[PDB]
Write an enzyme that holds these catalytic residues in place. Structure first.
Site, short mmCIF file in Angstrom:
data_model
loop_
_atom_site.label_atom_id
_atom_site.label_comp_id
_atom_site.label_asym_id
_atom_site.label_seq_id
_atom_site.Cartn_x
_atom_site.Cartn_y
_atom_site.Cartn_z
N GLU A 109 16.05 84.02 28.08
CA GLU A 109 16.00 84.80 26.85
C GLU A 109 16.45 86.24 27.05
OE1 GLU A 109 12.47 85.14 24.58
OE2 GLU A 109 11.51 86.68 25.81
N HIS A 110 16.42 86.74 28.29
CA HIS A 110 17.12 87.99 28.58
C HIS A 110 18.62 87.79 28.72
CE1 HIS A 110 13.27 89.77 28.90
NE2 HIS A 110 13.57 90.72 29.77
N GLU B 253 10.11 95.76 33.67
CA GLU B 253 9.39 95.40 32.45
C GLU B 253 8.02 94.82 32.77
OE1 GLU B 253 8.50 92.66 30.33
OE2 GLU B 253 8.24 94.00 28.60
#
Lengths: 445, 420, 56, 102, 146
Positions: free
Chosen positions: A59-60, A136
């Site tokens: 999804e990144h 992150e």
């Protein structure tokens, strides 16, 4: 028009099956916008411990690279339209949304076809987004709500893939390569587990023709006849307590196993969650608030917030409350919250039932106002429930809930069942698990 | 079944509006033109207590009655505090619209403002400010509006640190009795028909007729507040005076705002073809977040550049962003990028349109600004009528205007107005 | 001349601070930072049963 | 007439004898939860005046004498100051128990 | 002259002074006005018009001689206490490294004449200014309004 006539005048959901097992679903309305979206039944349950953070990595990585339009050409073709691109993933379902105008959907559905099966994964992009995911995951530790829910998912499910968070551990994301990520994409991003979604300004014949044109011919068959199967995750009633005394506010969450997705118990326990209520310190209701735990909470100033949650996965649920309090008021908050749960399980009044019924009815229509949670519930309901349940049917199963049925289903799920207790603050005035289990049953019963 | 947006003005000076969506959620929004800009230095921060005073004791409905009534009917009562205008929105179940609508009417037109409830809400003011200021950006925007105006828009939207414990019931009654007027406000409705809204407007709303103080024109000041916070990320913003809402240049300034880029379109993406995130990342390998910033009001707008960065290289991102706007002020821009900016602005207006809370806010903002509704197709036409030289003129007005700067963080390499 | 009290008379205790010692989320990523700036101005929402939201 | 009832109320005032120790009608009430929730509502000058009258009544009942005839509080000089707050507190608690009944 | 030209227009209680603070590289000279919140605009504008009158040169040489005697006497007040004398020669030996006699300081203050006062008032009124304010600010004037 009343509520029943208004929900019958809500426009219908059109669902069709494509030729490769795809689901395409639309809700036509009068908005000028359109959100297309793709929901994939792939998350943290369907991966094993060798490839933990592959869903977060994909999804990144599906936006920065594409076999058709490489590099920043997706950003060129998206910001020449005006589309926004959210991509949220859970422990079972991941998604790629879009948010654009209704005249651009021939470009938009082709771009969303280019995202999910044609994503080239460059190794320099893999290394740069590896550094992005570790920074992150360092920055995600300061937010307490996600790590407290990750701690509860670790301590509620043990030896089973709901223990694995959606971030993935640091060794298990530094040990990810190109071939493991394209193995996860070639095994889990399959068109029987895929639904396209639209929410207004959209013809379903246009979606069927365009998804046949661009986003058809997607896989449908596994490689070595290696079909994954869903397993029921074992709920272990346990506890976890990360005592860090230098953080100023204690985040403690108590949950118990709830129904799962497909049961009709879910409408009853979300009614019970509406009676228990949500709170934050910016709530201006004060001492006169209708939630009893909230009124005693602002009467004695015990918590800063509590959020009650019914997080349902397939075959299983977590069902509880996450309260942030100070260090001195934790035991009073566990006593009042387990007292309010036991009052809802033992003696629930019909005024509380119609209050929680109206709060759940308002929250269900206020979620399904906007086009992006209409797309979120149409993709999530096409993956989980088997269809989009119309809101008249949710209205009906809300309407059959009364005090005796709510008390019986609450006494099945909450009354004397083993909690999962998580906490990441000053966790000294949390009672121990025998005191929590002793509060889980009433001697007054 | 959505036939028309009915829109008419009561002869005292009230805008009443209603749309029949045949919607199961009914949303009635009252829109007063009394934000945080209409008070002066004597009554600072009373708009924060009037924003927090949605659940106090009113005339004909108590505080316990109003809390149990709103969350036992099922809907919400909430406010929206733009610095120009305030909104009292209520959403709820369509079967019992009337109790919610008379409850918001008793909130607005006949409050009581008891002194002990204000003394209870004084701690809630401090708690709400200390939760809302955990965002670093709203402190920068509050310091920005404190710098860039002289009076009557330079009042902070949140309450100051000293007025908590000083705002009186006489002060709140003076603010309500001057600036909550039926000739000033509007009342818009989504999912509710026109007949019961006009009956409620005749019943409990058409009493006040004195418009009060109209502000003091919001004269531009310019300067610097540069505090230090200790975060690794400096947050700086450099802003000049732009045109107001209803002028022929605010649309061009919004096309310029979406040309320089203001939205995370691809989430966790590079935000590539936005010009500021282009020209910063041509020179800087540091993590950053650069965007445009348009704050349009009815008197004079504010157009500027927002930079969030690590403190060791604040001068590189700030000077590269300001050199990008100095490049686009000389006409160095492409008409395909102007078309992408126009499509991004049309997409952003339809993002504001598509939710009924946002549609209620847009109908209330158009009702207070104009008094007649303007359709979104004509909004797309007015955005499409922005010429390619008008945003060059807007960047020239941004460069040639007097600057204003709000910054916070470690300020070792953050440049100044002499260096910009 | 070259002193602190010789320059300004009454302003020596306010430009000369005496002290009798005895009794006489940090957003660490560029891709995660996309959204923390200010697109639209200050909008404050305070609800009755909904929390605080800022529209930017 | 009503002057016999007013004379009976004046005789009951002088027989109750809390006009002797400097008090008005509402300083002698039993401070329960309703009277305490109403006693928080007064302005600061009336609250300190009530607490000074209570302290002078406590002091002079400790010394076991009374104020003189000029320093007694008359019936026409009596103000029912706590009543517009206590009626609101009693009506608010009646509304709260009505919503607890519902 | 600041107190005369403010008190000729204002009647509320106030305190208008001027303060100087010269460091090793650059210094500050300015007007410090403590006022009530209503008349502070008239106080600050009357004080700034008084320094404008000094800058055009409306001065009396006996008042300049009284200023010289005030500075000589105030430097002797700084000298006459032993902690002040220790601070005086500590700052002299710290910054300059040499100790002038106080009589030599009196000769320098007597050597300062009227045209240097006119030139320094012109330099203060023509230089870029900075203003710090605190209070109820509804009638406090801005730096562009001065």
């Amino acid at each position: 028009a009343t509520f029943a006539q208004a929900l019958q005048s809500v426009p219908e959901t059109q669902v069709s099956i494509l030729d490769n097992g795809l689901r395409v679903a639309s809700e036509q309305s009068s908005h000028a916008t359109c959100t297309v979206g793709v929901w994939i039944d792939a998350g943290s349950r369907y991966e094993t411990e060798k490839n933990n953070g592959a869903g977060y990595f994909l999804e990144h990585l599906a936006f920065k690279g594409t076999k058709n339009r490489p590099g920043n050409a997706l950003e060129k073709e998206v910001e020449s339209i005006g589309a926004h691109l959210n991509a949220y993933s859970t422990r079972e379902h991941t998604a790629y949304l879009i948010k654009a105008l209704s005249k651009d959907l021939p470009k938009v559905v082709e771009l969303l076809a280019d995202i999910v099966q044609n994503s080239s994964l460059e190794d320099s992009q893999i290394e740069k987004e590896r550094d992005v995911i570790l920074r992150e995951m360092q920055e995600n530790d300061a937010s307490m709500q996600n790590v407290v829910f990750d701690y509860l998912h670790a301590t509620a499910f043990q030896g089973t893939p709901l223990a694995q968070a959606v971030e993935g551990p640091s060794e298990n994301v530094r040990r990810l390569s190109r071939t493991d990520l394209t193995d996860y994409l070639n095994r889990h991003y399959k068109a029987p587990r895929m639904v396209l979604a639209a929410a207004g300004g959209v013809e379903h014949q246009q979606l069927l023709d365009l998804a046949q044109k661009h986003l058809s011919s997607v896989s449908r068959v596994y490689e070595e006849d290696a079909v994954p199967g869903l397993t029921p995750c074992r709920f272990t009633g346990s506890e976890i307590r990360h005592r860090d005394d230098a953080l100023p506010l204690a985040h403690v969450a108590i949950a118990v196993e709830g129904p799962g997705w497909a049961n009709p118990d879910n409408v009853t326990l979300q009614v019970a969650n509406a009676i228990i209520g949500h709170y934050d310190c910016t709530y201006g209701g004060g001492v006169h608030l209708s939630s009893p735990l909230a009124s005693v909470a602002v009467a004695n100033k015990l918590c800063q917030s509590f959020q009650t949650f019914n997080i349902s996965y397939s075959d299983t649920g977590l069902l509880g409350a996450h309260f942030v309090c100070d260090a001195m008021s934790i035991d009073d908050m566990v006593f009042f919250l387990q007292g309010q749960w036991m009052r809802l399980c033992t003696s629930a009044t019909e005024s509380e039932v119609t209050r929680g019924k109206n709060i759940l009815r308002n929250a269900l229509v206020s979620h399904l106002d906007g086009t992006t949670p209409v797309c979120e519930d149409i993709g999530r309901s096409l993956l989980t429930y088997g269809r989009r349940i119309p809101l008249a049917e949710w209205e009906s199963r809300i309407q059959e809930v009364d005090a005796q049925m709510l008390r019986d289903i609450c006494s099945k799920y909450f009354y004397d069942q083993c909690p999962a207790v998580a906490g990441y603050g000053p966790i000294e005035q949390l009672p121990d698990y025998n005191r929590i289990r002793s509060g889980m049953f009433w001697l007054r019963f | 079944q959505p036939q028309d947006l009915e829109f008419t003005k009561l002869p005292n000076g009230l805008v009443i509006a209603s749309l029949e969506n045949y919607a199961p959620l009914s949303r009635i929004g009252l829109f007063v033109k009394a934000g945080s800009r209409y008070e002066d230095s004597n009554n600072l921060g009373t708009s924060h207590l009037l924003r927090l005073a949605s659940s106090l004791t009113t005339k004909g409905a108590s505080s316990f009655k109003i809390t149990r009534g709103i969350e036992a009917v099922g809907g919400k009562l909430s406010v929206t505090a733009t610095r120009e205008n305030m909104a009292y929105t209520v959403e709820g179940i369509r079967s019992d619209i009337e109790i919610l609508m008379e409850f918001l009417l008793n909130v607005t037109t006949a409050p009581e403002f008891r002194r002990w409830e204000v003394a209870a809400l004084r701690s809630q003011l401090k708690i709400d400010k200390a939760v809302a200021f955990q965002n670093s950006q709203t402190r920068i925007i509050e310091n920005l509006h404190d710098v860039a105006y002289k009076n009557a828009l330079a009042n902070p939207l949140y309450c100051p640190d000293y007025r908590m414990g000083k705002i009186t019931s006489e002060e709140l009654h003076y603010f309500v009795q001057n600036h909550f007027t039926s000739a000033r406000m509007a009342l818009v409705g989504l999912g509710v028909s026109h007949s019961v809204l006009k009956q409620v407007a005749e019943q409990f709303l058409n009493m006040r007729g004195g418009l009060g103080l109209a502000g003091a024109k919001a004269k531009y000041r310019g300067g610097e507040i540069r505090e230090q916070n200790g975060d690794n990320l400096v947050h700086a913003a450099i802003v000049a005076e732009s045109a107001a809402i209803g002028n022929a240049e605010a649309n061009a300034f919004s096309v310029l705002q979406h040309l320089l880029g203001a939205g995370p379109h691809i989430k966790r993406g590079n935000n590539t073809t936005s010009l500021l995130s282009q020209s910063v990342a041509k020179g800087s390998h540091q993590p950053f977040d650069v965007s445009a910033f348009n704050a349009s009001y009815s008197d004079s707008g504010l157009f500027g550049i927002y930079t969030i960065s690590q403190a060791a290289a604040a001068g590189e991102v700030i000077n590269a962003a300001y050199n990008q706007v100095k490049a686009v002020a000389q006409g160095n821009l492409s008409s395909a990028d102007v078309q992408a900016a126009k499509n991004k602005l049309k997409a952003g207006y339809l993002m504001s349109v598509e939710t009924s809370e946002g549609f209620l806010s847009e109908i209330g903002s158009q009702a207070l600004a104009a008094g007649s509704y303007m359709p979104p197709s004509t909004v797309l036409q007015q955005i499409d009528s922005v010429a390619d030289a008008d945003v060059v003129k807007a960047a020239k007005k941004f460069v040639s205007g007097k600057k204003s700067m709000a910054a916070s963080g470690n300020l070792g390499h953050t440049p100044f107005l002499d260096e910009l | 001349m070259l002193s602190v009290a010789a320059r300004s008379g009454p302003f020596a205790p306010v430009l000369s601070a005496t002290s009798r010692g005895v009794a006489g989320r940090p957003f660490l990523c560029r891709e995660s930072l996309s959204g923390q700036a200010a697109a639209r101005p200050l909008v404050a929402t305070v609800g009755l049963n909904v929390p605080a939201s800022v529209r930017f | 007439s009503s002057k016999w009832l007013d004379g009976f109320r004046k005789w009951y005032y002088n027989a109750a004898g809390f006009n002797k120790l400097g008090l008005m009608r509402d300083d002698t009430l039993h401070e329960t939860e309703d009277v305490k929730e109403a006693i928080r509502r007064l302005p600061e000058d009336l609250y300190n005046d009530r607490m000074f009258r209570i302290k002078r009544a406590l002091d002079l009942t400790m010394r076991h004498q009374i104020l003189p005839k000029d320093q007694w509080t008359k019936y026409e000089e009596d103000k029912f100051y706590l009543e517009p707050y206590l009626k609101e507190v009693i009506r608010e608690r009646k509304e709260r128990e009505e919503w607890a009944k519902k």
